[PDB]
Structure 1
């Protein structure tokens, strides 16, 4: 009766006991990711015994299952791998079973949620938790016990294709969503995988995997907080390191971050895996070792002792040299023992040794995956993420009567899903046209015209769209950006966002802007919906359209969510998770810019009639955000009262509770406001962010009513990184700005730390 098999033994002793029975071959197997296609034929589902035997022995710790195959292919072949481990190895160390979950379990016919950049606009972490719980239920049904999220990278470089996968530009909002997502996932004993550690998403020129310029203060002030929350407070069982270098140290091989910060400072107890092919990049991209033939020893010696425990597939499996390095005396066995211990500790705490089998039987999968509860939530979370940017003269909400033109490439014909969806997803779900026709039924005439193809400058379709508008009371035009599913993205089909699709312009592509102009020029009131994965730069829309709506990449319920807002069944409540610049020329545009940035001189202007008004910052443009972080309108108006703090003279150990009464001055409808609290460290020892979101509350306010909003500020969380790179909450004044966006401040107060 080996002690490691006994659940009454403390976890640390179970780890010790198991580790001391393991051969070096078995230890290495734990640290190298396998793949379900080592024993499962992706096209036929046929089983290859020899490949399972090899995979288990050589890369047996964990394996990837993110293939677009039938449900039973995943479940039956995961089962065979777990049964093989249990019945046909000495030690029976259960496998971690890994797929993607970003905005839904990555398998066909599972529930697709709106993209992360969008659900961040909900400012509704509780609802995002509920999502993560239902995602874990779907994944769990087929035998998955690990998912490759959350992404707690920040949208700080708008040209980068993966903006959509983030929770926005702000550390606090991302950290809070990260925490909730992780909690909802791990509530099922499914491992989260907090990614991409660390400082990944500000690549040079916006290019996928390109290196990042920045210093240690920026890393600790802005990049690291969102990881800290998911890791330290939500107890994430795994982390993925990143593809980039940060001031010239590769993320995958950074001892300072992966060991000194992650373990010595934060006490992280579990494992870090590389990204996919990230280990080879040490030689191939970064040129820190010989690329041909690849110096597998050198790669291993760079990343494993740095604290990157596990090598992901997609590369050359450089970690197969661990045995040789140990025999040569070049790698201390204790480094291997620490990495293995981290993996085993996660497996014990996940419960895998007591319950290695996750999956439900085939007869139950339809009762666990794509449930009405999941579909309903997708629509709820989607509708709560929609951001009203403009609404002139009560154009919205639309009346469910008369005639309505529905125009534009994104209105119909394909679902405008973000990246990290499975092949052929785009052929199912609710389009804006579907949604709008469902909401009006027989009460309004709908006149649909495609208008243009998103990927073409061709204006053949304009006449039909102009005609549709001209015979309608109002026009809805749906344009934006597009991405691709996991097959089409990597086959090279055209895209304007997604992993490895980066842009040098944020303006509407192809004929989409000219299509809007042709409709507006009919004089019919035109509502423009932006359907997209990042900011779009078209400032002329704000005041030349009747209304302007942002729906970041939808859920499978997107068109219903959208029509719920358009016709006013739901009073829009989204706030921007990411700042909108006037031009790609104006980047970066994050709201949390250090003092001395952004607001410097006078802006120039180009008028549409040709007149140039010359300024300084810039000569002929404006570095101020077109729309700021936290911006979002309502059909209802909100009047804030005086801001109150419960305590004014405080200590670094205190909590200051911010209070404010918010009145819904609309007498006819309920409205939801997101009250946002920004902290300003007024006078600091080093230069700090001008203002930082440090709390918020989304509240539903009945018509004509006043609601008391209370938001706590833990003083310990408002510090900075001083000249000695120590975290301190320096004595002195802290401003508290309370408002409806990062710019729209409605009241303020000041407290003093002593």
Structure 2
């Protein structure tokens, strides 16, 4: 007599079948459309509108967005009102999924802000990233959130595109490892991850946000899909978000081959796909696959729902409201609707929502769960591990805590240089470089600060003050780079050089920043430049014209403390680049995993700083090789690698090859951390393959003078290619194993053979 779907002990598929058979067609439509908390919650006052909750639950009640910059109790209270309404005032009581952003911290004011993804990928520390994700899930779940819109497992393969910072770099393997760990950390709370943006999104034409992508099926399977497969199938993500683009002319939101044939029929994915925000309308408005004005809502629904895009996100025209009419007209098979709903319900059952619909903590516990010291300490630790040392001439770094230090530049103080996907007014809280350097030295050194310039201006009126600061100091630290905006300022249109919908046609420093550096170097004071940015910057004259060069991708709220830890030697920098740096925007793309036959062609030309021209061929007056390659990063210590050893030389597809190498820290006094990287070369292939691929790594702490044996496993099944019949095969033959300190700095090699 009680419904079987309410029984926690019944197998999930039986619960899904029982619930689906009780649902009206309107109740099915409602599970597939995303609502919004502001449908019942006034964003300024927090005041409740029942009529709005009734409508939202009826028409778009399966899940709703909560990413507004409001007090914690507005979110907790109005989420509770929604879950209570569902239980008391609907027949079936299907609990809502409650969605927000988490990219590099729970998107609510005064929560912990971690460094941006492109930066924490430079840690090469997926276990530390899993701890971050567990703390983000702790913070989110405290307020009643049960779904976060991450990770991004897109690859940074088009450096003009504004969302490079949101990715884990250009490499499929590193992005897949980080996405697996991030997904696992979030879902350890029974909160759903949302792997995005499926698939092939982040190589837009011209670098423009949402522009179409040129590519074939071999590139899609070889490069784009692996990070998705690691986060979705291996970590068991409960949801996916499809993308805005077309890939070889098929919209991602309407691609049956990717969303159904690969994702379900090949991989066996069990759960649901949502569109991106207004991605449904784009089928007509951007792609012209239907009438745009007025929008053909039926045509949108008939394109995307049968393709395998189960859920329509807000931000569009709510085209799926046509489902009732389409099923009643015989234009849409009820089985397609039932499959979509089943996917959403399956995730909600497995998450535990029917047994625990509202997971918020009481108000008295929020300060014990959100912005804890454990989370702030982890923010500092992970930021510190992400900093990449690019140059260090004649032991300029680390700095002594003595004498006088100039701290110069627009990114040194006055605002926090956060990446995108932070809440409004975040930039007014956190540790700046100046704050961290002043705290580090105390009364032992004099700090001479000068802004030098505004990041958004070519005005040089601040230079004389900065030159005076440098001249009165023993060393100068100059902090410059790119900037983004928070989730109100970005969409209001305030100036930026990176972030969603902020694309660039140049990677050089903007405004007076490069001339500011030149003015300080020209004092003859040793000058340490810190790049504070969301993507590569092209200024190759910095490598040999400064005393040291440090990369800190957009910081955590502890950014200046992490930076001072490295600058003063309390931490030996250990980061390695997650993305290759070109010499110029004219040299793109620059990824390290180019196909054999790319990049290494001919001789490069050069333009001397005095204007002399030295003509070459690839290019006439420039260089297509990376300025700094994927995996690059220096240390205050030096590392010497021994002979590479394999445990097995003659293997099957079924085998694991363990790579062993002894690494010695040859420094006289300082412990350091090395990221040992393993690149695999498929020496002879039946189709053209990537020249080399990262397939393992290990980050190892090595005391001064000590030797550590580093072991890295290679699963042979993971080393295959997509052959001329579009089948995945590990072909018999030789595989080279290249071991070293970057994708170019190879210190040893070995070979094994697949039979």
TM range (shorter): over 0.9
User: What is the distance in 2 between the residues matched to 1:77 and 1:362?
Assistant: 14
CA offsets per residue over residues 285-333 of structure 1, 9 Å max, x none? 0000000100000000000000000000000000000010001100000
Corresponding position: 1:597 with 2:583: no
**How far apart are 1:36 and its partner, in Å?**
0.3
Match of 2:488, SS? helix
Q: 1:544-580, CA deviations, whole angstroms, 9 ceiling, x for partnerless residues?
A: 0000000000000000000000000000000000000
Residue 357 of structure 1 and its aligned partner are, at CA, apart by 1.3
Who is 1:585 aligned against?
586
| Deviation for aligned residue 1:621 | 0.3
Q: Distance in 1 between matches of 2:504 and 2:623?
A: 20
Q: Which residue of 1 aligns with 2:227?
A: 226
2:582 and 2:231 map into 1 onto residues whose CA distance is 29
Q: Shift in Å at residue 439 of structure 1?
A: 0.3
| Residue 571 of structure 1: aligned partner | 572
Structure 1 unaligned blocks of 5 or more: none
CA distance in 2, matches of 1:401, 1:450: 22
Q: Secondary structure at 2:353's aligned position in 1?
A: coil
- 1:693-749, Cα deviation, whole Å (9 max, x unpaired): 000000000111000100000000000000000000000000000000000000000
Alignment deviations for residues 69-116 of structure 1 (CA, whole Å, 9 cap, x no partner): 000000000000001111111101000000000000000000000000
Query: Within 2, Cα distance between the matches of 1:652 and 1:363?
Result: 55
**SS in structure 1 of the partner of residue 640 of structure 2:** strand
Classify the secondary structure of the residue corresponding to 1:173.
Answer: helix
SS in 2 for 1:75: helix
Q: Equivalent residue of 2:122, what SS?
A: helix
Give the CA deviation at 1:639.
0.2
TM-superposed CA distance for 1:609, in Å, is: 1.5
SS in 1 for 2:751: strand
Kindly report structure 1 stretches of 4+ aligned residues shifted beyond 3 Å.
none
Distance in 1 separating the partners of 2:491 and 2:61: 27
Partner Cα separation in structure 2 for residue 582 and residue 322 of structure 1: 52
- 2: distance between equivalents of 1:502 and 1:485? 16
Cα distance, 1:502 vs structure 2: 0.2
- Distance in 2 between residues matched to 1:115 and 1:311, nearest whole Å: 28
* Offset at residue 243 of structure 1 (A): 0.2
The Cα offsets for residues 146-195 of structure 1, whole Å up to 9 and x where unpaired, read as 00000000000000000000000000000000000000000000000000
Q: Find the residue that maps to 1:409 and give its secondary structure.
A: coil
The RMSD of aligned alpha carbons is: 0.3
Report SS of the residue matched to 1:159. Answer: coil
Distance 1:242 1:515 in 2: 40
1:190 partnered with 2:230: no
SS at match of 2:748: strand
Alpha-carbon shift at residue 679 of structure 1 (Å): 0.2
Deviation of residue 340 (structure 1)? 0.1
Write the deviation string for residues 216-259 of structure 1: whole angstroms up to 9, x where unpaired.
Answer: 00000000000000011000000000000000000000000000
Structure 1 position 656, deviation (Å): 0.2
Give the count of matched residue pairs. Answer: 754
SS of structure 1 residue aligned to 2:709: strand
Partner SS state of residue 658, structure 1: strand
Counterpart position of 2:346: 345
TM-score, with normalisation over the residues of structure 1?
1.00
Give 3-state SS (helix, strand or coil) of 1:751's partner.
strand
Name the CA distance, whole Å, in 2 between partners of 1:662 and 1:190: 40
Find the aligned partners of 1:315 and 1:631 in 2 and give their Cα distance: 42
Shift of 1:669: 1.3
| TM-score for the superposition, normalised by structure 2 | 1.00
Aligned to 2:447: 446
Rounded to whole Å, the distance in 1 between the matches of 2:474 and 2:405 is 6
Task: Encode CA deviations 1:446-483: one digit per residue, 9 max, x unaligned.
Answer: 00000000000000000000000001000000000000
Deviations 1:527-548, CA, capped at 9 Å, x for gaps: 0000000000000000000000
User: Tell me, what secondary structure is at the counterpart of 1:370?
Assistant: coil
Give 1:64 shift.
0.2
SS in 2 for 1:626: coil
Secondary structure of 2:281's counterpart equals helix
Q: Is the partner of 1:535 in helix, strand or coil?
A: coil
Hey, what's the Cα distance between the residues in 2 that align with 1:34 and 1:454?
A: 39
Matches within 5 A, 1:200-219: 200-219=201-220
Give CA deviations for 1:562-617 in whole Å, capped at 9, x if unaligned.
00000000000000000000000000000000000000000001111111110000
**How big is the shift at 1:667?**
2.8
- Listed one character per residue, the Cα deviations across residues 482-529 of structure 1 (whole Å, up to 9, x for unaligned) are 000000000000000000000000000000000000000000000000
Question: Counterparts of 2:86 and 2:257 in 1: how far apart (Å)?
Answer: 36
CA–CA distance in structure 2, aligned partners of residues 643 and 561 of structure 1: 34
Q: Summarize deviations over 1:369-393 as a string: whole Å, max 9, x none.
A: 0000000000000000000000000
TM-superposed deviation, 1:645: 0.2
Provide Cα deviations, 1:659-690, integer angstroms capped at 9, x if missing partner: 00000011311100000000000000000000
Q: Secondary structure at the match of 1:363?
A: helix
- Structure 2 residue runs of 5 or longer lacking an equivalent are none
Q: Helix, strand or coil for the counterpart of 2:657? A: strand
Aligned mates of 1:418, 1:68 — CA distance in 2: 17
CA–CA separation in structure 2 for the residues paired with 1:360 and 1:650: 52
For the residue of structure 1 that corresponds to 2:406, the secondary structure is strand
Q: Deviations over 1:398-450 (max 9, x none)?
A: 00000000000000000000000000000000000000000000000000000
* Cα distance in 1 for residues equivalent to 2:265 and 2:322: 28
Matching residue of 1:427: 428
Please state whether the residue corresponding to 1:486 is helix, strand or coil: coil
Partners of 1:430 and 1:86 in 2: CA distance: 45
Q: Distance in 2 between matches of 1:698 and 1:264?
A: 37
> d(CA) in 2 for partners of 1:677 and 1:85?
52
SS in 2 for 1:113: coil
